[PDB]
Design a binder for this molecule. Structure first.
Ligand code: HEM
Ligand code: MYJ
Length: 137
């Protein structure tokens, strides 16, 4: 289930982080508005950019911590405030995060692994709600 999935993802986190974020950007190409330097690149070209791998992994490092500190897929309010108040999220709305978790959930469903996709779907919905409660438009 959810906790085991965190362990699974952490066991190959650079690969999963890049592949899930690539699934996100390909499913929602307009989201490149927030990542202008990734425009005009293929998946393999992004995986060769040190910035891409570093940033992707740091994002998922934090995402797994938030997931890990959650109870029953409900994130801590403190984690939600951190996500809303970090300056790199200045322009973001909850729809950006929703789309990321849609892509994540569809990635797990398309995988042949026993991911608990329904728990990640709930986690995403509860994080979006916590973000709104913490002040994200
Ligand atoms: C649970 C979900 C997320 C977590 C835990 C998270 C975390 C982070 C972290 C840790 C960084 C800084 C890492 C670094 O500077 O190398 C970062 C930067 C950033 N994040 Fe997020 N993030 C999340 C979702 C999103 C989403 C959905 C978007 C946009 C659709 C987004 C847009 C950005 C941008 C634009 C930056 C800075 C620019 C860049 O690094 O290229 N984040 N985020
Ligand atoms: C800013 C950023 C975020 C993510 N992410 O996984 O959210 C991946 C690559 C990036 O450059």
């Amino acid at each position: 289930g959810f906790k085991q999935d965190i362990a699974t993802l952490r066991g190959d986190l650079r690969t999963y982080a890049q592949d899930i974020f690539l699934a996100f950007l390909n499913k929602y190409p307009d989201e490149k508005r927030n990542f202008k330097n990734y425009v005009g690149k293929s998946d393999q070209e992004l995986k060769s950019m040190a910035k891409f791998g570093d940033h992707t992994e740091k994002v998922f490092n934090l995402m797994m911590e938030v997931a890990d500190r959650a109870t029953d897929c409900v994130p801590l309010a403190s984690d939600a405030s951190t996500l809303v108040q970090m300056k790199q999220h200045s322009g973001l709305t909850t729809g950006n995060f929703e789309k990321l978790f849609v892509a994540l959930v569809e990635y797990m469903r398309a995988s042949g692994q026993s991911f608990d996709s329904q728990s990640w779907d709930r986690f995403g919905k509860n994080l979006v709600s916590a973000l709104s409660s913490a002040g994200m438009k």
